[PDB]
Design a protein around this nucleic acid. Structure first.
Ligand SMILES: Nc1nc2c(ncn2[C@@H]2O[C@H](COP(=O)(O)OP(=O)(O)O)[C@@H](O)[C@H]2O)c(=O)[nH]1
Ligand SMILES: [Cl-]
Ligand SMILES: [Mn+2]
Ligand SMILES: [Mn+2]
Ligand SMILES: [Mn+2]
Length: 553
RNA sequence: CGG
């Protein structure tokens, strides 16, 4: 049947100038040495990505799918969802969102300038009046930082971003935002990934794991997922949306956005030229996360049925997936996964790496992270979330005239606070830089999965207690996997090894303590791992007085 | 570019 794309031969052009690094990285050249390995994907590599994702799809459904789709619609039907006022939608546009072709940008939209509010009204009326004319879209390459891996080809080609003009995005939100906040949770319940913090993700997986008489786990990820999404898949997304109780005006807008935007359309590069046509998901539209998550859930739950996965518990995180099931013995389990992959491939969701059965929770990696284990202050086992730090370390080293890495550092410190690599390496480097800049008591802003919240470095110990618990300051005896991986990653980026970080950290601690106040609370809590005479830490009054539920839900 |  359908091709994912077709191209004119016009280049994918850059959204402005694309920054290369500088000869000195003053913030990060005491963190690591191999700055040559850190790189940023650019539009120069866009064509190679385009070759890798242009292919022919041949979806083939079956009773298992149909049965699942059916159940998902009955679940959707228990949702009622309102329209958003043009104004409400305007004010959810982010502060630096790409400006519109019709001579205004995000400032005008969020302030509700009349010029802007006007253009958008007319755009909405055209949605309601015309359910057919394709809507044009811009195509850009994403700028994104990685460490080179010669094992996996050297340098990654940039992924493709495909979005309509600002005005349409606002209309998108009007028609569909309230649904994005309610549907995924409603059809998937506890399987919905983006509702849990790290400690909750870990708790869920453990409960899941212990509930089985004899558990088996595996993860799945679809190769180039957005290009594998079919016109049919997209129309089937519409019907899932339509199964909620909605005002009539939503339905028309939703339906019109589907046929004119979501199922496909022409693509223009930044220079204005016609670039290609698209019959797959455009990553850049409002329905991207919801769509991926839901369409992934359907296919996956079908494939579980297709393959005989017994008593599955799922966690869906976009196109990443984990399933914890009752094992049928390794002979059968291996067969069943081949079947799963076979079904998923029939549903047009082929794998990147073939999945594999596992019987130890530390060896399953999904949503870029994994559960590991260490000992707590009282000798008991303590389970927590962590990840390969390679890419975090690389991003910690991205400095340009326009961009600072301190934000990245913070993001990781908060998300992965219990990790040996955050405690020994990142926390040590973070606090050291800020002390010396004399900017310890100055807010930064941290963004995990969507929005951006302001944080004061001196509040980390409270925020970490609230979010990860007080054991997060006291854990020891990390696992072989986790020790091996951290050492290896530090070697690979030319950063000092752990024993050096022990030295630097003692020194940082002392400085923090000598400044007294909150700084010294940072010193005692965050760096107690670093001294022989470990102190007695106690819950922090500050912590109880805190609401963080907006951060990961 | 979107949650
Ligand atoms: N809008 C948007 N969507 C993204 C981005 N990164 C990933 N996604 C979506 O999530 C899908 C799966 O992500 P991933 O497994 O990391 O990459 P892929 O499967 O190789 O495309 C993508 O195909 C996109 O639709 C991004 O930066 N912006
Ligand atoms: Cl303990
Ligand atoms: Mn994928
Ligand atoms: Mn319709
Ligand atoms: Mn993925």
């Amino acid at each position: 049947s359908s091709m994912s794309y077709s191209w004119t031969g016009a280049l994918i052009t850059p959204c402005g100038p694309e920054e290369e690094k500088l000869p000195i990285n003053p913030l990060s050249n005491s963190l690591l040495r191999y700055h040559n390995k850190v790189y940023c994907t650019t539009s120069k590599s866009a064509s190679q990505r385009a070759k890798k994702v242009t292919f022919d799809r041949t979806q083939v459904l079956d009773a298992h799918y149909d049965s699942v789709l059916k159940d998902i619609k009955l679940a959707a039907s228990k949702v009622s969802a309102r329209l958003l006022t043009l104004q409400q939608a305007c004010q959810l546009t982010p502060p630096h969102s790409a400006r519109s072709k019709y001579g205004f940008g995000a400032k005008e939209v969020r302030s509700l300038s009349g010029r802007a509010v006007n253009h958008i009204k007319s755009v909405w009326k055209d949605l309601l009046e015309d359910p057919q004319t394709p809507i044009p879209t811009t195509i850009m390459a994403k700028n994104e930082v990685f460490c080179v891996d010669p094992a996996k080809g050297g340098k990654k080609p940039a992924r493709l971003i495909v979005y309509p003009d600002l005005g349409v995005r606002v209309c998108e939100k009007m028609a569909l935002y309230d649904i994005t906040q309610k549907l995924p949770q409603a059809v998937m319940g506890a399987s919905y990934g983006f509702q849990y913090s790290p400690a909750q993700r870990v708790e869920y997986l453990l409960k899941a794991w212990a509930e089985k008489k004899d558990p088996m786990g595996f993860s799945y990820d679809t190769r180039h997922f957005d290009s594998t999404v079919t016109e049919r898949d997209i129309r089937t997304e519409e019907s899932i949306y339509q199964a909620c109780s909605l005002p009539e005006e939503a339905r028309t807008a939703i339906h019109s956005l589907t046929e004119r935007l979501y199922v496909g359309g022409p693509m223009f590069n930044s220079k204005g030229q016609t670039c290609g046509y698209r019959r797959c998901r455009a990553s850049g539209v409002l329905t991207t996360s919801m769509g991926n998550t839901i369409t992934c859930y359907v296919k996956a739950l079908a494939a579980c049925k297709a393959a005989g996965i017994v008593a599955p518990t799922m966690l869906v995180c976009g196109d990443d997936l984990i399933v914890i099931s009752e094992s049928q013995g390794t002979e059968e389990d291996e067969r069943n996964l081949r079947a799963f992959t076979e079904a998923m491939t029939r549903y047009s969701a082929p794998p990147g790496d073939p999945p594999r059965p596992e019987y130890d929770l530390e060896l399953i990696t999904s949503c870029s992270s994994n559960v590991s284990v260490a000992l707590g202050p009282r000798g008991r086992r303590r389970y927590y979330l962590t990840r390969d730090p390679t890419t975090p370390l690389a991003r910690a080293a991205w400095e340009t005239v326009r961009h600072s890495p301190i934000n990245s550092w913070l993001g990781n410190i908060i998300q992965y606070a219990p990790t040996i690599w955050v405690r020994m390496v990142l926390m040590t480097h973070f606090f050291s830089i800020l002390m010396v800049q004399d900017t310890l008591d100055q807010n930064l802003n941290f963004e995990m999965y969507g929005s951006v919240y302001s944080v004061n470095p001196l509040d980390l110990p409270a925020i970490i207690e609230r979010l990860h618990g007080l054991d997060a300051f006291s854990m020891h005896t990390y696992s072989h996997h986790e020790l091996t991986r951290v050492a290896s990653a530090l070697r690979k980026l030319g950063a000092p090894p752990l024993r050096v970080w022990k030295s630097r950290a003692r020194a940082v601690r002392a400085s923090l303590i000598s400044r007294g106040g909150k700084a010294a609370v940072c010193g005692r809590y965050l760096f107690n791992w670093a001294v022989k005479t470990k102190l007695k830490l106690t819950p922090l009054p500050e912590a109880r007085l805190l609401d963080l539920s907006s951060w990961f839900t």
